[PDB]
Amino acid sequence: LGEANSFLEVLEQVSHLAPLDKPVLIIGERGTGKELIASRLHYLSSRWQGPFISLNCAALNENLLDSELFGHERHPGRFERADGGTLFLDQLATAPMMVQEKLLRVIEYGELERVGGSQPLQVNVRLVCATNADLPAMVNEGTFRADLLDRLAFDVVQLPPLRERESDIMLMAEYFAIQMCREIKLPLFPGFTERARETLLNYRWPGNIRELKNVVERSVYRHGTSDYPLDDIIIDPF
């Protein structure tokens, strides 16, 4: 979430892309809300009453990924489960080259192939994928299929990292701090000192919004009082 102009521009882009049936590629670091953007593409589309299915490609080994996406024997895969809806594939760049070619087969031909006896399955799925890799760099290296990229990247949504939305950092920090005050029953958030603000604004936030929420919640809890402003931002609890 947030309100920097670069983020508002993303929301505008998403509102125009959502009604299309074309695949959308989301590029962004961890904690920038890629799955929320994918969900927004679905719910602003004509498919909104259909299924919204997610899969993280990085999480499964190659055989398990293959079966989870395309099914086997019956274990229906994620494409089948997303029929009439939207399938979100996260960490796309980790997909093995076998899975990449099979993904292209389903995209251009619009159907899954069955082992023996079973006829192929036709599927109608809107695809949204996400990564933080440099996919054109991977194409040059031969670790990502050029023909798949020629097809998947109809258009690209680039999510700005928190460090490039500096105006959003104190806005969101205040929001998360207030919510933590409610959780631990403090009567009022007593504010951030200038030292705290320097700490927040100078940090690069590799975990972006998710990390900001955790750091601020921990800091409010450790502070534990409404009697004076929060001075000590605990970035590293280790």
Measured between alpha carbons, how far is 1 from 36 in angstroms, rounded to an integer?
Answer: 9
Helices (H), the chain: 5-17, 34-43, 62-70, 78-81, 97-109, 135-141, 146-152, 166-183, 194-202, 208-223
Task: Note whether 55 and 150 are same-domain residues.
Answer: yes
Q: Note whether 225 and 190 are within 8 A (CB).
A: yes
CA 87 from chain centre, in angstroms, equals: 13
Return the half-sphere exposure (C-beta side, CA atoms, 13 A cut-off) of residue 160: 19
Buried b (16+ CB within 10 A) or exposed e, 83-108: bebbbbbbbbbebbeebbebbbebee
Helix (H) or strand (E) holding 111: strand 111-112
Q: How far apart (Å, rounded) are the C-alpha atoms in residues 124 and 95?
A: 21
3-state secondary structure of 132: coil
Indicate whether 23 and 123 sit together in one domain. Answer: yes
Q: Are residues 155 and 131 located together in one domain of the fold?
A: yes
| Burial category of 11 from C-beta neighbours within 10 Å (exposed 0-12, middle 13-18, buried 19 and up) | middle
CA 81 to chain centre: 20
168: its two tokens = 């959003």
State which of 162, 193, 222 marks the end of a domain. Answer: 162
Q: Could you tell me the two tokens for 52?
A: 């919204």
Q: Which amino acid is at 216?
A: V
Q: Integer distance in angstroms from the first to the last C-alpha of the chain?
A: 28
Q: Residue 8's domain spans which residues?
A: 1-162
| Residue in the structure block whose two tokens are 């205040």 | 174
Residue linked to tokens 């194409």: 139
Last residue of a domain, one of 132, 162, 192: 162
> Are 227 and 123 in a shared domain?
no
- Indicate if 84 and 139 belong to the same structural domain: yes
C-alpha–C-alpha distance, residues 139 and 146, integer Å: 6
Q: Do 150 and 175 sit in the same domain of this protein?
A: no
Q: Does 69 lie in the same domain as 31?
A: yes
Q: Return the number of other C-beta atoms located less than 10 Å from residue 142's C-beta.
A: 9
Domain count of the fold of the chain: 2
Query: Experimental method for this entry?
Result: X-ray
233: number of Cβ within 10 Å:
22
Are the beta carbons of 30 and 161 closer than 8 angstroms? no
Domain limit, last residue, from 112, 132, 162: 162
* Tokens 């809300």 -> residue: 33
Residues 73 and 138 in one domain: yes
Same domain for 72 and 2: yes
DSSP state of 164: G
Judged by phi (left if over 0) then psi (alpha if -120 to 50, else beta), residue 125 lies in: beta
Distance CA 147, CA 144 (A): 9
Residue 190 belongs to a domain with what CATH number?
1.10.8.60
In whole angstroms, give the CA distance from residue 210 to residue 71.
32
- Domain co-membership, 100 together with 195: no
* The residue type at 209: I
| Cα 35 to Cα 71: distance, rounded to the nearest angstrom | 23
CATH number of the CATH domain containing 134: 3.40.50.300
If DSSP codes are grouped into helix, strand and coil, which group holds residue 238? coil
Alpha-carbon span 53 to 82, nearest angstrom: 6
